[PDB]
Amino acid sequence: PVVRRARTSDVPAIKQLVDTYAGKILLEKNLVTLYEAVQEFWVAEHPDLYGKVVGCGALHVLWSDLGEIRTVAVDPAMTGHGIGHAIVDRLLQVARDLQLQRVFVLTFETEFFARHGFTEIEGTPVTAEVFDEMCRSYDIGVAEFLDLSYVKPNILGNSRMLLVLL
Amino acid sequence: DCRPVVRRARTSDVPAIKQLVDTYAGKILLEKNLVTLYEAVQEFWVAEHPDLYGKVVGCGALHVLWSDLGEIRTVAVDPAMTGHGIGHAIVDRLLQVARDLQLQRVFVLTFETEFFARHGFTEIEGTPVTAEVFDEMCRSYDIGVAEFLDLSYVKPNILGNSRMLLVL
Numbered sequence: 662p663v664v665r666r667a668r669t670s671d672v673p674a675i676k677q678l679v680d681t682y683a684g685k686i687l688l689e690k691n692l693v694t695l696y697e698a699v700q701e702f703w704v705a706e707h708p709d710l711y712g713k714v715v716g717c718g719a720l721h722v723l724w725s726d727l728g729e730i731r732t733v734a735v736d737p738a739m740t741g742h743g744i745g746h747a748i749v750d751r752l753l754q755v756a757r758d759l760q761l762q763r764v765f766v767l768t769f770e771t772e773f774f775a776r777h778g779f780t781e782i783e784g785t786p787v788t789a790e791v792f793d794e795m796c797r798s799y800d801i802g803v804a805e806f807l808d809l810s811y812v813k814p815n816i817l818g819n820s821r822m823l824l825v826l827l
Numbered sequence: 828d829c830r831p832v833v834r835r836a837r838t839s840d841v842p843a844i845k846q847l848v849d850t851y852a853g854k855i856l857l858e859k860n861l862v863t864l865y866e867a868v869q870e871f872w873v874a875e876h877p878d879l880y881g882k883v884v885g886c887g888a889l890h891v892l893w894s895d896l897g898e899i900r901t902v903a904v905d906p907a908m909t910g911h912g913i914g915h916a917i918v919d920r921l922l923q924v925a926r927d928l929q930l931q932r933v934f935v936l937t938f939e940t941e942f943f944a945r946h947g948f949t950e951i952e953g954t955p956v957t958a959e960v961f962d963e964m965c966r967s968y969d970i971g972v973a974e975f976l977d978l979s980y981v982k983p984n985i986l987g988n989s990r991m992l993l994v995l
């Protein structure tokens with residue numbers, strides 16, 4: 662499973678992957694937001710059809726020592742082949758290369774992420790001072806990490822998970 | 828003066844980037860709070876101080892706007908270190924990021940008309956995207972994007988800036 666940095670030509674395929682699960686499962690992403698985020702997105706290619714994109718994932722930095730895995734989606738016709746886990750592996754190595762100590766994820770796929778050492782947590786693990794700084798973010802994923810009131814209706818039932826990197 | 832090293836930002840650079848932005852924030856540079864700078868760290872570049880190891884004397888970002896279009900934004904040099912080639916070295920590296928990303932056009936909104944003319948930027952009027960791309964880009968939460976789109980509610984804050992474009 663080859664995982665590589667996304668290119669702008671991958672964005673339509675990424676968009677189709679997100680829309681497949683957008684709603685309760687994945688937070689929506691419109692096209693412009695995906696172009697804007699292309700330098701943090703990664704894609705998995707089909708093993709035998711060169712250059713076809715069957716999965717995507719992004720690592721989003723939240724603070725100096727904290728990152729989040731987000732927008733991990735695998736083509737439903739290509740699941741169960743190691744693609745999801747390979748994307749998470751590469752995204753975690755990005756977090757390491759960026760010298761992050763902790764990675765967050767908000768998800769229903771509790772056991773999938775438990776394979777990588779993520780454990781369920783309660784609350785929001787940042788100081789009160791960092792919490793107030795992060796509230797000025799415009800990114801809705803950040804508000805979901807912060808558990809802000811106006812996104813509470815959209816995330817009910819998700820598990821909050823954290824991985825401390827070695 | 829010799830060409831400085833321009834490298835990808837690390838999270839430990841973000842406070843210094845923040846101070847560079849705050850120096851010019853307002854009429855010149857769009858404001859950037861800490862969380863936004865951390866979130867954008869994977870598109871920021873910094874010029875290393877010529878003599879102070881691990882210190883940065885300038886910063887800049889390449890922001891993707893669409894499949895074939897990018898923007899140079901948040902270029903800032905320590906005012907006590909200007910006029911030594913650091914600004915141009917950052918823009919040089921940002922333009923190579925744009926080509927590696929297969930962008931055909933790079934935008935900048937700026938008062939420094941001549942600084943950017945050295946790289947081939949020319950002044951334009953309006954917003955060079957189709958009506959369909961314009962409508963998609965309007966859904967962005969990024970204020971710089973709204974400035975690129977020339978939306979009404981940001982017109983008072985960008986008066987006097989030149990809109991410039993470089994075709995790669």
Ligand SMILES: CC(C)(COP(=O)(O)OP(=O)(O)OC[C@H]1O[C@@H](n2cnc3c(N)ncnc32)[C@H](O)[C@@H]1OP(=O)(O)O)[C@@H](O)C(=O)NCCC(=O)NCCS
Pocket residue numbers: 682686687730731732733734735736739740741742743744745746747767768769770772773776
């Ligand atoms: C969750 C999701 C990303 C997993 O995608 P996937 O491609 O099926 O993931 P994998 O194939 O790597 O692993 C699934 C199973 O395939 C099998 N597997 C086969 N080959 C494997 C390999 N080389 N490595 C690991 N597992 C493999 C395993 O049995 C694995 O079971 P496990 O998770 O209990 O270990 C996918 O279902 C999805 O897109 N869901 C919606 C988006 C979402 O929920 N994202 C999480 C929030 S961001």
Ligand SMILES: CC(C)(COP(=O)(O)OP(=O)(O)OC[C@H]1O[C@@H](n2cnc3c(N)ncnc32)[C@H](O)[C@@H]1OP(=O)(O)O)[C@@H](O)C(=O)NCCC(=O)NCCS
Pocket residue numbers: 828829851855856899900901902903904905908909910911912913914915916936937938939941942945
């Ligand atoms: C505009 C700005 C980025 C330029 O920074 P800078 O480091 O002074 O840029 P440079 O030193 O590379 O070039 C400026 C002049 O110094 C001259 N220069 C002097 N010594 C030099 C040297 N050893 N090597 C190279 N150039 C030198 C250059 O000739 C140049 O003149 P030119 O533009 O006519 O070619 C900086 O003043 C700034 O941060 N302004 C506020 C933020 C801003 O306006 N950003 C733009 C919008 S994002």
Ligand SMILES: CC(=O)N[C@@H](CCC(N)=O)C(=O)O
Pocket residue numbers: 684685686687688689730731732733766767768802805806815816819
């Ligand atoms: C898209 C994505 O990354 N998943 C959401 C889950 C919450 C939601 N569906 O709105 C999240 O914060 O991770």
Ligand SMILES: CC(=O)N[C@@H](CCC(N)=O)C(=O)O
Pocket residue numbers: 853854855856857858899900901902935936937971974984985988
């Ligand atoms: C940070 C940044 O780069 N801001 C605007 C300048 C316009 C403004 N809002 O002052 C720009 O395109 O240069």
